[PDB]
Design a protein around this ligand. Structure first.
Ligand SMILES: O=P(O)(O)OC[C@H]1O[C@](O)(CO)[C@@H](O)[C@@H]1O
Length: 319
């Protein structure tokens, strides 16, 4: 066993486990992970900043990792594999120097349980963000909570960029009566839509694509007004105990093999950032989508992330 590695993972358990096992088997490193939301994981790393408990932060959305970079929580390391990453996303965070790197892309949207829709007596599948404010969807939608979930923050930032911040919060307020719960995890609305516990889930479409691929009666929607996206992040923690192995993990996560195994074995259907990697047949093609130019440098920062989340809690979660 060539050393150890502790991962804070913010992707799904199945993806994290497959990455940790594939790394351990490829490189003989004793690898373990702890899984938590992108926002939850940031708070934990910030809290542990004097005596870091993990070596790398893998998966989840980029914005909290960018914020961690800004706050001095990360250790800069540019993997030679960055040369293979889509040039647009080679060094995308607020603070340059690859404190954080982009390992995948996820499209924000929603999906609809077409069988439950029918039971609600609704015949039209919603096609726009605006449709989700219709009163007939009372208690029939779920979205995550940005206090824990990177997905929820990606949505907030997407809406602020689309409509302007004030209209974004107006949207949250009109959406609110249709939300049955603000979920801790970004993926929970996908799971509950798949279950038919809810009719509409808002989140990253590859999660819905996997439920669909496994039989769920879901129709995925890229909303007609346009939408944003996540970059999945990988970052080394400042003070990492196993630095060398952390660098090796970053290499692997940015590698053709490390990215392909996410969809080949890890049941994770994000679009890959390594231009030499084979994409899943179910991965979204960004060139075909109505996407805003999501400003990672701007929203992966405290003056947006802490401000908007605290504002979201004040005006939406409370009143
Ligand atoms: O919203 P959360 O809980 O931080 O999780 C975000 C992550 O969940 C996923 O959608 C799971 O596939 C990831 O692509 C994304 O990075």
């Amino acid at each position: 066993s060539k050393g150890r590695l502790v991962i804070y993972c913010s992707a799904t358990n199945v993806m994290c486990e497959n990455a940790a096992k594939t790394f351990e088997q490829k490189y003989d490193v004793k690898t373990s992970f702890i899984r938590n939301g992108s926002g939850s994981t940031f708070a934990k790393i910030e809290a542990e900043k004097n005596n870091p408990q993990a070596d790398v932060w893998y998966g989840g959305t980029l914005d909290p990792q960018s914020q961690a970079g800004e706050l001095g929580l990360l250790e800069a390391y540019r993997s030679p594999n960055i040369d293979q990453i889509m040039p647009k996303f080679q060094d995308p965070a607020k603070v340059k120097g690859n404190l954080s790197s982009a390992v995948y892309i996820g499209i924000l949207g929603f999906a609809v349980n077409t069988e439950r829709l029918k039971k609600l007596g609704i015949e039209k599948i919603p096609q726009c963000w605006n449709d989700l404010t219709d009163p007939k969807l009372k208690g029939e939608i779920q979205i995550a909570d940005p206090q824990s979930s990177g997905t929820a923050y990606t949505a907030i930032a997407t809406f602020a960029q689309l409509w302007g911040e004030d209209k974004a919060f107006d949207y949250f307020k009109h959406l609110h009566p249709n939300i049955s719960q603000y979920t801790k995890s970004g993926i929970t609305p996908a799971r509950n839509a798949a279950r038919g516990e809810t009719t509409v889930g808002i989140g990253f479409l590859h999660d819905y694509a996997l439920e669909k691929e496994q039989g769920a009666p879901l129709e995925m929607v890229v909303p007609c007004e346009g939408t944003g996206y996540e970059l999945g992040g990988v970052s080394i923690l400042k003070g990492a105990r196993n630095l060398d192995n952390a660098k090796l993990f970053v290499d692997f996560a940015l590698s053709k093999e490390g990215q392909e195994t996410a969809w080949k074995k890890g049941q994770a259907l994000q679009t890959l950032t390594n231009t030499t990697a084979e994409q899943s047949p179910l991965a979204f093609d960004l060139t075909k989508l109505k996407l805003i130019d999501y400003d990672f440098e701007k929203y992966g920062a405290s003056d947006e992330r802490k401000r908007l989340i605290n504002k979201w809690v004040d005006e939406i979660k409370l009143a």
